[PDB]
Enzyme design. Structure first.
Site, PDB file in Angstrom:
ATOM      1  N   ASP A 100       0.894  -1.180   0.016  1.00 27.00           N
ATOM      2  CA  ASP A 100       0.018  -0.015   0.004  1.00 27.00           C
ATOM      3  C   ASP A 100       0.808   1.192   0.003  1.00 27.00           C
ATOM      4  OD1 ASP A 100       0.625  -1.111   2.744  1.00 27.00           O
ATOM      5  OD2 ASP A 100      -0.650   0.184   3.519  1.00 27.00           O
ATOM      6  N   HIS A 152       9.153   0.867   9.543  1.00 26.95           N
ATOM      7  CA  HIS A 152       8.280  -0.270   9.607  1.00 26.95           C
ATOM      8  C   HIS A 152       8.407  -1.384   8.483  1.00 26.95           C
ATOM      9  CE1 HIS A 152       6.125   1.522  13.010  1.00 26.95           C
ATOM     10  NE2 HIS A 152       6.159   2.667  12.259  1.00 26.95           N
TER      11      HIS A 152
HETATM   12 CA   LIG Z   1       2.476  -0.493   4.457  1.00 27.28          CA
END
Ligand SMILES: [Ca+2]
Ligand SMILES: [Ca+2]
Lengths: 318, 318
Positions: free
Chosen positions: B10, B242
């Site tokens: 995403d 992340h």
């Molecule tokens: Ca992501």
């Protein structure tokens, strides 16, 4: 000094330990005992609590029976005996008497005694928060009238004891727990994350049995069944001092480090009874279910040596 | 060597970082990219993913569009732009492009490519597990056919990033997450508990901007908006890596320590999207919702210095 204390209990071997330690601590004045379900059924808890006070000699202390079901009428009849025994006192089967509870209902009595002494009463919740939540739901001014609420319950960023997500007392009544953690009272939470650090080995129990103390010898007899549980469930030659460590916080709170923040309880499974603490100074690009919730003190670290030494010098003393 | 990799993304500033790092790592062969909602809407994610591959020069890599809603049709239109910007690439607004996705649906394509290369494909899930769960629900043999599933998601015994209980990717689709954690595939979970240890300071970003690298200079431009978010939400002069730290686990898994056990996801609030890990380990007197669940590897510790150094020497190299 000393501070007035009401103890919401489900005796309970560990509960009996906490009751006895409170009765041996001069800094606390046990004004009353309120019974609840959990380890045992509410009538069994009452019978045991009356018996423990008879043994302690403190027959002056009233016993007020509480909720027999959860706050929303979830039946608490037929409950597990693998931890505390059939009698609830480690299958010791004491020769219980005809002494009866003070006819006043525990939540009703809780409101009565807190209005009588505002900001003086310290309620030590050693079982499900049902009795306390009913008092909060009944009188909205109860939360600000209580001196402090010391709760044994929850698993803060650690696995639970009932199931991997939840702790016993909170799993008992998640609706009541969420009511209390949101009520806005002076709350001190002692979770299994810190009680699992406070333990007594087989030798510690042996030392308590060998001691010339009425209480120490009594607790050693009840401990046998509780010890066999820990040896088969956790595979350890030690017992976790859940309820008595919570009583230590009432005696000397300096032995624990606290974090201030909001606590919420998940009421519906798989994670039913999960306690979630927000100590995350990230506060919060869009409001969360922890935003605008009154903060509570949550125990983070323990002085395990000093807690276990105090819960011994008091229970071994003749 | 090298290992075939499909990336469920995403994009996403942190996603772009991971995509670029994977394209700069010779030990990985990026066979395809699958788009999903989360940071941006599914069509936006596709546009960005096509653009990133154009910039990287690797135009040979197909882009397969996935779910525009959650697995159970929960609409994912109208989503927060305070973290990745309106465009999803830190408000840089790139000069995109008439290049179109490979007309095959992401879950359908995932099953196709895994049957083509059984036990070779490593799916790196950098967004909600919707595309992967649909593939599992469609073909039951998919889970045992995948080489490994590296998931960026969850908060294991730590507070979440969306709300105090849940992490973004898992909160996006808790139903899909629970399907994946139970599917029985070779799963490696990289939670925010370990990604919050891997961060880049303002100076680290400055070093990436000053560098004579096409990617490093690009990522620095997109980073500005992501940096302003961390500075107002967490109040830190650093950004949590992340998605790129999850990509490091695909490159070199030795940089992390793993714990094997069962993971379950709470689907209904207050704790919607909570990931609970059971150490397995644990003897349970009465079966739990974690009992009989296929175990997964959950990252416990990171070599933060070595992870952040690798994600720099690769992104700074000309
Ligand atoms: Ca992501
Ligand atoms: Ca108890």
């Amino acid at each position: 000094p000393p501070k007035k204390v009401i103890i919401d209990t489900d005796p309970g071997i560990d509960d009996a330990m906490a009751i006895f330690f409170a009765l041996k601590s001069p800094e606390l004045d046990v004004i009353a005992l309120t019974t609840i379900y959990g380890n045992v059924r509410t009538p069994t808890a009452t019978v045991n609590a009356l018996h423990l006070l008879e043994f302690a000699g403190r027959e002056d202390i009233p016993v007020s029976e509480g909720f027999r079901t959860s706050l929303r009428g979830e039946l608490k009849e037929r409950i597990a005996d693998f931890v505390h025994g059939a009698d609830g006192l480690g299958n010791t089967y004491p020769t219980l008497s005809d002494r009866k509870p003070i006819d006043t209902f525990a939540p009703d009595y809780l409101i009565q005694k807190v209005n009588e002494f505002p900001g003086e009463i310290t309620i030590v919740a050693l079982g499900p928060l049902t009795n306390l939540a009913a008092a909060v739901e009944c009188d909205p001014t109860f939360a600000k009238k209580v001196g402090q609420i010391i709760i044994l319950g929850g698993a803060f960023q650690v696995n639970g004891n009932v199931n991997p997500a939840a702790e016993a007392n909170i799993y008992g009544d998640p609706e009541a727990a969420d009511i209390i953690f949101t009520c806005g009272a002076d709350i001190l939470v002692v979770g299994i994350n810190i009680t699992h650090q406070v333990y007594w080995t087989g030798k510690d129990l042996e030392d308590l049995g060998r001691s010339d103390s009425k209480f120490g010898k009594y607790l050693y007899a009840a401990s046998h069944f509780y010890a066999t549980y820990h040896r088969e469930a956790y595979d350890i030659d030690a017992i976790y001092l859940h309820d008595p460590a919570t009583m230590v916080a009432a005696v000397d709170p300096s032995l624990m480090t606290y974090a201030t923040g909001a606590v919420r309880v998940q009421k519906d499974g798989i994670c039913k009874g999960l306690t979630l603490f927000n100590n995350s100074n990230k506060v919060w690009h869009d409001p969360t279910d922890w935003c605008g919730i009154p903060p509570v003190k949550v125990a983070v670290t323990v002085d395990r040596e000093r807690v276990a030494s105090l819960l011994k010098e008091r229970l071994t003393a003749p």
